[PDB]
């Protein structure tokens with residue numbers, strides 16, 4: 001649907017399961033208002049965060065709680081979390097996949113944006 | 117120089133030059149206080165941000181102003197900026213290089229943490 | 233199925249479509265024997281390369297023809313192709329997803345390996 | 349020094365030290381002739397591979413022996429090695445840095461190509 005987060009573990013070559021993800025939307029007063037949250041599945045994906053109607057134009061932040069993920073695996077990683085910030089739907093509704101590839105001292109994040 | 121930031125451009129295969137970087141330290145009230153800032157050099161590097169005396173244990177955020185970089189180059193970017201958030205810890209290595217590899221719709225960031 | 237290749241374009245934030253992919257398997261005489269080939273779909277994926285029965289233990293090479301991809305978009309990229317080489321099925325049959333994220337002067341490749 | 353290779357370790361957040369690297373040039377019969385080799389230094393770098401006189405236009409392959417690196421560290425890796433294949437072109441910039449960021453099940457590689 002309109003916003004999906006996918007997380008992979010580059011150490012094990014596997015989905016990153018049970019990763020907490022918090023989504024925020026910037027308000028007109030400039031604060032970050034909570035928008036949605038959840039955790040990744042067995043497949044490393046988190047679906048169902050929002051609907052096209054709810055997912056209006058705005059600046060969004062996707063915070064992925066990578067530190068908690070590594071700590072549960074016995075690892076003390078470098079980053080507190082990964083934060084992905086972007087304008088969405090400024091030229092009409094799109095579908096966003098926010099992917100993150102995780103390693104203890106590194107991550108990458110990519111967006112796949114498609115027109116429904 | 118306990119903290120350096122290095123930014124590369126994956127489209128042009130070059131250092132990312134003149135990228136604004138802002139560094140923040142987390143205050144006790146959970147807000148981000150400005151701490152240091154600069155623009156990357158012709159080698160994509162930003163040095164001289166802080167000193168070992170003032171770079172005490174705490175949580176820091178490095179914000180790299182990727183959107184402006186791509187706008188200057190005439191390429192549509194996805195992210196507002198790249199954020200790197202981490203804890204500084206005296207027990208470990210005392211030189212932190214925050215590296216970022218930029219593409220319009222993806223970035224990676226890595227910490228190279230060493231002793232001298 | 234047992235081997236899938238997924239390719240993304242980090243410039244556009246989209247699947248990399250119509251990318252040629254050639255798979256090779258190392259023979260006992262040490263040469264690279266052609267094993268399968270195809271091109272990525274509208275979704276950037278290439279499925280149907282092999283079956284579990286055909287996909288025996290071996291060292292495989294997945295060559296992704298990234299240069300042809302960029303050239304068709306007007307770009308002169310750095311790499312001739314991306315080549316991904318790995319042992320497969322040495323502890324029994326697994327499912328492999330070979331992902332590649334492409335930029336003109338950079339790529340990343342990741343494997344997601346699951347036990348059916 | 350027209351060619352340098354730099355390797356980083358995304359698990360430990362460090363230079364990848366003592367990684368074997370072999371460089372090849374494509375011969376007119378389409379085979380790979382050995383050209384240079386070395387191990388990365390304590391800074392993850394390999395210099396002195398060739399000279400501008402002998403580094404003529406052609407297609408080169410840089411093979412980074414990632415599997416051995418991870419084996420030494422006691423972590424199961426995916427890839428046999430990382431291969432980087434590119435054409436050297438006199439018309440452009442004349443210093444090539446081949447950078448590789450390593451995780452057990454993923455790697456990225458980037459070319460930083462500059463003039464001095």
Ligand SMILES: O=C(O)c1ccccc1Nc1cc(Cl)c(OOO)c(Cl)c1
Nearest residue numbers: 215216217224225226354447449456458
């Ligand atoms: O090559 C990459 O994929 C990469 C990914 C994340 C961060 C940096 C990347 N490249 C890179 C990083 C560092 Cl610290 C670096 O060292 O220079 O001081 C180089 Cl040459 C390249």
Ligand SMILES: O=C(O)c1ccccc1Nc1cc(Cl)c(OOO)c(Cl)c1
Nearest residue numbers: 099101108110329331332333340341342
């Ligand atoms: O291919 C990579 O190296 C990579 C780079 C950045 C982010 C994620 C990465 N892998 C990746 C792997 C898979 Cl299987 C994937 O989607 O699968 O449905 C995506 Cl979007 C990305």
